[PDB]
Design a protein around this ligand. Structure first.
Ligand SMILES: [C-]#[N+]/C=C\c1c[nH]c2ccccc12
Length: 296
C-alpha cells in the first residue's frame, strides 16, 4: 500500500530473490539498506540475477552516482560491511581514486553476503593509466600486449571485488573489429574459454563494454564478460535462456517500462549470464552515454 520508496525497493528485492530461489540473509539486507537505502531511491539502481552452473541463482543489488569521491567506502565501513582482510584489496579502491580522477562511483551487494564490489568510473582514459596503481595484480601489467591486440585501449571503469579477491578492468568496445563475431571467437579462444553459439555471438557484436578479471593468485585472466543493453522487456533475447525470459518478463521496476543490461560471462565455471533490471530507468541511458552511443 502506501510506503516509502526505500521500503518498496526492499520488498521488490526480497520478492525477486524468492521467485528465483536465490539465497539471502535478512540481517545482511537490513545492514545494506541502513547504509545505502537512500542512495538506492535516488540514483541509478539495479537488481541483478545471475545463473552460475550447478548452483543457486544469486541476487545482487547495485547503484552508481555521478560523484567524484568514493562515497560508498565511508558508508560501507561505518555499516560494518567492509573489514580489512590483510590483502591488496583493502587499499585498492583508495589507490584507484588517487591515481585516476573519477567522474562517478558505485557499489554492488550480494543479498546473502554483503558488499561485494566498489566501482570507480573515470572519463575514458588509456589503459596504461591503470599501471600507476600499486596494488593491482601483477597480471594486469603482464597483459599489455593482449590489451593492444584486442583493442582494449580505452579504460572506462575499474572495480574491486572484496569477496572474490579480484579486480576488473572495463573497456569501451569502440573498435569496428569488435562489431564482428570473429573478434569474440578470437578473444575467447585466446584464454581457452568456451565459444558460445552463433546466436550468442550475433548478440555480442553489439556489446559496448568488455570486462576482464584479474586476481593475485594466478597469472592469467580469470574470466571476461561482454555487456549488452536492451531498452525494454521485449527486446531482451528471452529465447536464449530461461532466466533471461523470466527476469525480463517478471523483474520488478518502479518505472513502468524498464530496460535491462545483460552480461555474458565466460571462463575456463566462469561461464554464465547476468541480467540487471534498470529499476528507475536511469542506468541504460547512462550506459549508452558513457560509451558515446546514441540511445536506441
Ligand atoms: C558492470 N557493469 C555495467 C553497468 C551496470 C550494471 N548495473 C548497473 C547499476 C547501476 C549502474 C551501472 C550498472
Amino acid at each position: 500500500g502506501a510506503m516509502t520508496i526505500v521500503n518498496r525497493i526492499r520488498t521488490d528485492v526480497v520478492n525477486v530473490a524468492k521467485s528465483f530461489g536465490a539465497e539471502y540473509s535478512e540481517a545482511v539486507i537490513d545492514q545494506i539498506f541502513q547504509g545505502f537505502g537512500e542512495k538506492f531511491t535516488n540514483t541509478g539502481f539495479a537488481i541483478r540475477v545471475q545463473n552460475k552452473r550447478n548452483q543457486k541463482v544469486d541476487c545482487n543489488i547495485r547503484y552508481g552516482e555521478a560523484k567524484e569521491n568514493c562515497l560508498a567506502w565511508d558508508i560501507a565501513r561505518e555499516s560494518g560491511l567492509l573489514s580489512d582482510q590483510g590483502h591488496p584489496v583493502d587499499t585498492l579502491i583508495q589507490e584507484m581514486f588517487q591515481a585516476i580522477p573519477a567522474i562517478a562511483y558505485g557499489a554492488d551487494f550480494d543479498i546473502n553476503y554483503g558488499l561485494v564490489k566498489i566501482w570507480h568510473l573515470p572519463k575514458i582514459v588509456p589503459v596504461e593509466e591503470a599501471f600507476k596503481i600499486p596494488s593491482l595484480p601483477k597480471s594486469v601489467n603482464a597483459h599489455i600486449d593482449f590489451f593492444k591486440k584486442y583493442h582494449l585501449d580505452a579504460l572506462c571503469a575499474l572495480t574491486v571485488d572484496y569477496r572474490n579477491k579480484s579486480t576488473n578492468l572495463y573497456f569501451d568496445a569502440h573498435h569496428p573489429e569488435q562489431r564482428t563475431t570473429q573478434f569474440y571467437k578470437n578473444i575467447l579462444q585466446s584464454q581457452q574459454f568456451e565459444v558460445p553459439s552463433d546466436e550468442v555471438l550475433e548478440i555480442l557484436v553489439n556489446c559496448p563494454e568488455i570486462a576482464v578479471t584479474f586476481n593475485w593468485s594466478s597469472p592469467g585472466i580469470e574470466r571476461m564478460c561482454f555487456y549488452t543493453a536492451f531498452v525494454n522487456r521485449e527486446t531482451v533475447p528471452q529465447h536464449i535462456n530461461p532466466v533471461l525470459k523470466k527476469f525480463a518478463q517478471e523483474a520488478p521496476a518502479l518505472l513502468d517500462n524498464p530496460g535491462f543490461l545483460v552480461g555474458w560471462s565466460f571462463g575456463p565455471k566462469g561461464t554464465y549470464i547476468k541480467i540487471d533490471v534498470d529499476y528507475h530507468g536511469l542506468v541504460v541511458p547512462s550506459f549508452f552515454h558513457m560509451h558515446n552511443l546514441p540511445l536506441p
